[PDB]
């Protein structure tokens, strides 16, 4: 699997555990067609979403449902969710890590863009 | 004016100038609608994107143009564009600052929420 | 004044207000020697910390007392401090903004360096 | 290990490799004595820094040496270096994971702490 997202909670010191996330793939129309999802393992990461085949060049979009992850925990934070959008492969396959660092009124995110 | 949006260069330590961006306004069949837009100002600053009363309670983006920054600097970027996505709520502080932090891999937001 | 620090806070998404630091000038027998110190203002910053003709050249480094901070919100935090170390270099521009975006396991600093 | 340490590259959206890193510990006399040192592999990461039995409660810095690693690179920086001081194991043995982010003018460090 050529995406992973790895997700930190900024408050507890730990990793995000089950924090949801939709991943959608710009179409020829440009909308926004759905591609994958899941949720965060107990480490935080989430694995598996998709294959060096089903991964072709686009432009994706990864929806981190922070909102639902902070009202789970009691807390009222300030976004909706924390988006991540970027062109895939446009020069050939990659492998991309996207890190997000969570507090209630901000975050971080940063890839991570390998050549296997 | 309730929304101002301030954002910074990680790279070379300084606002960063002549960023584009536009605000949607979420509508009732979800689809985003277009609400303001402009472009960062010599400190990096973009006021007068509305009024209170035209500021009502809702869900909004913020779509800051973070790759057309990165390209006129002759640097390639990561993301298509920085999106930060909340809702107005009434029942907190009056005024919001958005902030974001730009490198070409990574950036960071931050809502700062207070009250004259 | 040629420096200023502002300083956030990521949980509340407010100004960190009431924050105290230290200002040292790293002196030739590379001991840390006291410069300048206050406190963050309502709005999260600290002015009036030195005068151009004060501060020349030389590494200063800004220790934040982010400790005490949270824990005056009854919030346990991961640091004892923050601290940024830093060359003033009059090659560059002349203002330095040295901003801080805490929340209770991470922070973040960013230096914005402008010319009037 | 205990301790372990992970840098990433905001620009180059990459794993910060051959970053070198001092660890210091402080002293009952409030000097900062050496504890520990190395620098980074190619994945980022920094293992091996110390042992559960070497690793007792204490204030602990880690100076993570950005700027060396930013000249080498080519790029002048604005920090010296990146400073995480913390109290380690005064609850008893936990495992620390230091994160920082660096860009040149800029960087985040965040503290992952999990009980073994
Ligand atoms: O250090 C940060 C500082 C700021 C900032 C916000 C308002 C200002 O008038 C200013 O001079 C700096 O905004 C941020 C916004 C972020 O999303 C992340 C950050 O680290 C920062
Ligand atoms: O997005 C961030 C991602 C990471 C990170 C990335 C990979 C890891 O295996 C890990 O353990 C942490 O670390 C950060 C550390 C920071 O201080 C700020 C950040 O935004 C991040
Ligand atoms: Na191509
Ligand atoms: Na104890």
Known sequence: CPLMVKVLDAVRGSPAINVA???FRK????TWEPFASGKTSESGELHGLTTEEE???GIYKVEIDTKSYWKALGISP???HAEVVFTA???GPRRYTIAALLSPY???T???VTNP
Chains 1, 2, 3, 4 share one sequence.
């Not at 179409?27 to 440009?30: I, L, N, P, R, S």
């Open 78 to 80: 300030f976004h909706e």
């Open 21 to 23: 996330m939709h991943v």
């Open 106 to 108: 901000s975050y971080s």
């Open 110 to 112: 940063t890839a991570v």
């Open 55 to 57: 991964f072709v060049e």
């Open 27 to 30: 179409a020829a129309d440009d």
């Open 89 to 91: 492969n446009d020069s």
